[PDB]
Ligand binder design. Structure first.
Ligand SMILES: *[C@@H]1O[C@H](CO)[C@@H](O[C@@H]2O[C@H](CO)[C@@H](O[C@H]3O[C@H](CO)[C@@H](O)[C@H](O)[C@@H]3O)[C@H](O)[C@H]2NC(C)=O)[C@H](O)[C@H]1NC(C)=O
Ligand SMILES: *[C@@H]1O[C@H](CO)[C@@H](O)[C@H](O)[C@H]1NC(C)=O
Ligand SMILES: [Cu+2]
Ligand SMILES: [Cu+2]
Ligand SMILES: [Cu+2]
Length: 535
């Protein structure tokens, strides 16, 4: 490893913070079905926070002026409208990662909101229970917007999964674990990602926005919701007793990007790359009175990646395990979690997408996103199941690939270094898959249920910004209906950002009056954006 560049930090001295739950402002009755739609207001604004206790503070920009943004908790079947208000200094575009939103509510990179404007995002919340996350996607400034704080968690819940009796209680035994990797100046401010064209690895590991924290835990089971929200750093996570720091302790993975696995996957090492979500149950029962360190495999994630490793990037956080529990642990991890809704399999030859570099620019089949005339790389009729072959021929870089709209099954992985194939925790449904060194992955997806133009890209945010993103069009015929003509173009004027005055927001009047919000949402709802999922 390489010497740390950021100032020395007081390791494992600050408790793991938990982002607060985001509460809706009000609900609006949907005239179509008489259901309540939950309406939220999120203010994107600059803020500072004192990351290094004995230095200066860091400049950030976040949802509701915090990083991570607040955590949404939404039950399946409840539609939501979130008004993302830009009261900051650069444009934004919000992507709810994990949601089959319509194209104009999906965070298309050109679909920006300027400072002094807001955009209303209408979300369906119909998919399987899963850990989604919302984050910036504005063209060519995504890495810095995310880095400086525009990412938060969004939990879609299902009461039918209650009976599973998994470890529960947000911030109690259900713990968000948002990972980031950054670098700090000598006075404790952030080093900018601007100017970086290869990757911004970072030498300070954060969980939920906090460098190298600790958490006091009871000797029992916890559900951890891991999310790699870093700009460029991938992880190989493992747990180890501080008395045997090299010995990986077993745990279970219970969910991936799109929701629960069919069965828990017994795991001692969890590969997790940018934008991937995995939910883990760890049992601290056997480690009462010990300290368990969450660590990160070195040698560039054990040869799967190419990331630079530093003095302390092998460390994530510490769990200090109590002698005994306060209450008995009545939670379980069932052998059978759910039936996973895999798409009907196809034998058609996969579509092929090569992720590489064309000179300094990161590209897809030699194309960059700025190239408007060539960036639409696939037309797929709505309802088609397709396999895509995702190729990383290079040994010098890696790419976690995200395909919007869909959930996909990971069919195969080859490695030119023979390092791995499909992992056990990739057994279910995902929407990001890591192309490690010399890896080719085939995925299978139902391109459904909504027509429109959607993105796919590498989710290394440096690669993404420069310029590794393309589009596909999920297409329908002229007689399809469902108001498709106003929902296929992500830049559709009907759904564009709107200017606001700060005073009317603060006074909750005008555009922000109960009447105006109610009427705006009821009118949106009349277009019935998500009806095709209700067949
Ligand atoms: C993505 O695929 C869309 C189809 O799902 C496609 O939208 C379709 O575009 C065609 C051609 O512009 C439209 O066809 C008709 O449009 C006008 C209006 O009536 C007619 O005068 C024309 O002669 C033509 O027959 C379709 O109406 C339209 N379909 C929908 C549902 O909007 C998009 O163009 C594709 N997007 C990209 C970027 O390629
Ligand atoms: C399309 O939107 C219009 C305008 O809101 C609405 O009146 C109509 O019912 C919608 N039609 C469908 C098929 O969703
Ligand atoms: Cu994402
Ligand atoms: Cu990449
Ligand atoms: Cu994206």
């Amino acid at each position: 490893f390489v010497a740390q560049i950021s100032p020395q930090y007081p390791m494992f001295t600050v408790p793991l913070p938990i982002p607060p739950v985001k509460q809706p402002r009000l609900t609006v009755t949907n005239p179509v079905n008489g259901q309540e739609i939950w309406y939220y207001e999120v203010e994107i604004k600059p803020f500072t926070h004192q990351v290094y206790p004995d230095l200066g503070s860091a400049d950030l920009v976040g949802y509701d002026g915090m990083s991570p943004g607040p955590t949404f908790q939404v039950p399946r079947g409840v539609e939501t409208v979130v008004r993302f208000i830009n009261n900051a200094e650069a444009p934004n575009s919000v992507h709810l990662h994990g949601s089959f939103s319509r194209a104009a509510f999906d965070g298309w990179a050109e679909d920006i909101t300027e400072p002094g404007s807001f955009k209303d995002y209408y979300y369906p919340n119909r998919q399987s229970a899963r850990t989604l996350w919302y984050h910036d996607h504005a063209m060519h400034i995504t890495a810095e917007n995310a880095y400086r704080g525009q990412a938060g968690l969004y939990m879609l819940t299902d009461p039918a999964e209650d009976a599973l009796n998994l470890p529960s209680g947000y911030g109690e035994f259900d713990i968000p674990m948002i990972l980031t990797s950054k670098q700090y100046t000598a006075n404790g401010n952030l080093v900018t990602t601007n100017g970086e064209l290869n990757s911004f690895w970072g030498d300070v590991i954060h969980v939920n926005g906090q460098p190298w924290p600790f958490k006091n835990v009871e000797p029992r089971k916890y559900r951890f919701r891991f999310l790699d929200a870093a700009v460029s750093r991938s992880f190989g996570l493992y747990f180890a007793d501080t008395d045997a720091i090299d010995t990986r302790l077993p745990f279970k993975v219970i969910a991936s990007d799109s929701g629960l696995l069919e069965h828990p996957a017994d795991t001692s090492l969890l590969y997790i790359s940018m934008a991937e979500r995995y939910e883990v149950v760890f049992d601290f029962s056997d480690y009462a009175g010990k300290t368990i360190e969450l660590r990160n495999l070195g040698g560039s994630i054990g040869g799967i990646g190419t990331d630079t490793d530093y003095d302390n990037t092998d460390k994530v956080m510490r769990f200090v395990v109590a002698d005994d529990t306060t209450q008995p642990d009545t939670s379980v991890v069932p052998a059978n979690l759910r039936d996973v809704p895999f798409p009907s399999p196809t034998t058609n030859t996969p579509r092929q997408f090569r992720f590489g570099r064309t000179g300094p620019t990161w590209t897809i089949n030699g194309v960059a996103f700025a190239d408007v005339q060539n960036r639409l790389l696939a037309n797929v009729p709505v309802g088609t199941v397709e396999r895509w072959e995702l190729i990383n021929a290079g040994n010098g870089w890696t790419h976690p690939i995200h395909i919007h709209l869909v959930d996909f099954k990971v069919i195969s992985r080859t490695s030119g270094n023979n390092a791995r194939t499909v992992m056990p925790y990739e057994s279910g449904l995902k929407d990001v898959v890591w192309l490690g060194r010399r890896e080719t992955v085939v995925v299978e997806a139902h391109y459904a249920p909504f027509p429109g133009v959607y993105m796919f890209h590498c989710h290394n945010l440096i690669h993404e910004d420069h310029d590794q993103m393309a589009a596909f069009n999920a297409t329908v015929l002229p007689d399809y209906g469902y108001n498709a003509t106003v929902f296929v173009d992500p830049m559709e004027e009907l759904w564009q950002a709107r200017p606001y005055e700060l005073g009317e927001f603060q006074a909750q009047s005008g555009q922000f009056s109960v009447q105006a919000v109610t009427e705006r949402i009821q009118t949106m709802a009349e277009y019935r954006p998500y009806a095709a999922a209700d067949e």
